[PDB]
Structure 1
């Protein structure tokens, strides 16, 4: 993982390593860059499943000390541990008991997934799905004692790119 480039053309053309496929059984994996393996992190107490694929941009460091994380919408779930070339639609702003958290929302490169080319920004994402994603983050850790998540709202591509820009910078010191 630690040698996969952050992107062909940052911040708009970036790579995402998938950790949790959309609709997978409710087990959270986290990539160990140090090992090149997915690690079983948690069996989700609520047993709720990610509504979209979940992963990270390698060679990034967000303020929380982990890589920039990303939700990638696709017509079929992606393989855990695989890498996909992606583009941003925006971000979901949240705060939990430890501080700010933001998850980017992305889709594959148009050449990879023509099915998603019509999605130009976060607002093109179907209402039911944005609502579903918001609900997921608000509730999935409900049975993890000591934890809480509050969703603040959505932001656009600019904000997503800033997040990418900074994470790439921080990672290099």
Structure 2
């Protein structure tokens, strides 16, 4: 996660470290140090599973103190902790109760995943998947307090690439 380059040919050709695999259970665990065990923290959202793989681009800083943030679309889930060579489709833009959030949207390299090769951009994503992606985030916080999420929409590849370019630059200081 630390020694993983951002990409072989940036910003078109980037690496993503998987965090949460598609279809993952909506449950947050939390290592107790003082204990050496995983503790069940809480149950996330209204009970909907993660609809895509979620991860990050290593060696990036997105002005969120966080790394650049990626939703990776694949026909089968990817292992948490794995690294996938990827390419951008675009981005999901959201507003929060505490600001703005863009998630990058990606598919793997065509040689890795030949089945996603027909997905040239975000407009190529079936409407059902896109609708499951946005709905996930709209229900994610659900319930909690004075928390919420509004999906503002989708941006394109060029915006994706800018997020990536800037992320790689920030991270260098």
Shift in CA distance, 63/82, structure 1 to aligned 2, threshold 3 Å: same
Instruction: Name stretches of at least 5 consecutive residues in structure 2 with no aligned partner.
Output: none
Query: Is the contact between residue 20 and residue 54 of structure 1 (CA under 8 Å) also seen in structure 2?
Result: yes
What does the per-residue CA deviation read over 1:130-163, in whole Å, with 9 as the maximum and x for residues that have no partner? 1111111111111232321111010100000000
Structure 1 length normalisation: TM-score?
Answer: 0.90
The alpha-carbon deviation at position 91 of structure 1 amounts to: 0.3
Structure 1 range deviating more: 39-48 or 163-172? 39-48
What does the per-residue CA deviation read over 1:110-142, in whole Å, with 9 as the maximum and x for residues that have no partner? 010001001001000001111111111111111
Secondary structure (helix, strand or coil) at the match of 1:84 reads strand
Secondary structure (helix, strand or coil) at the match of 2:45 reads coil
The alpha-carbon deviation at position 28 of structure 1 amounts to: 4.6
What does the per-residue CA deviation read over 1:87-123, in whole Å, with 9 as the maximum and x for residues that have no partner? 0000001111221100011000001000100100100
Structure 1 range deviating more: 127-136 or 24-33? 24-33
Shift in CA distance, 34/117, structure 1 to aligned 2, threshold 3 Å: farther
Shift in CA distance, 23/170, structure 1 to aligned 2, threshold 3 Å: same
Shift in CA distance, 89/149, structure 1 to aligned 2, threshold 3 Å: same
Query: Is the contact between residue 45 and residue 139 of structure 2 (CA under 8 Å) also seen in structure 1?
Result: no
Query: Is the contact between residue 6 and residue 15 of structure 1 (CA under 8 Å) also seen in structure 2?
Result: yes
Shift in CA distance, 44/82, structure 1 to aligned 2, threshold 3 Å: same
Structure 1 range deviating more: 151-160 or 21-30? 21-30
Structure 2 length normalisation: TM-score?
Answer: 0.90
Query: Is the contact between residue 12 and residue 87 of structure 1 (CA under 8 Å) also seen in structure 2?
Result: yes
Q: Distance in 2 between matches of 1:68 and 1:35?
A: 31
Query: Considering only aligned residues, what root-mean-square deviation do their CA atoms show, in Å?
Result: 3.4
Q: Distance in 2 between matches of 1:11 and 1:33?
A: 37
Shift in CA distance, 143/83, structure 1 to aligned 2, threshold 3 Å: same
Instruction: Name stretches of at least 5 consecutive residues in structure 1 with no aligned partner.
Output: none
The alpha-carbon deviation at position 40 of structure 1 amounts to: 8.0
Q: Count how many residue pairs are aligned between Structure 1 and Structure 2.
A: 173
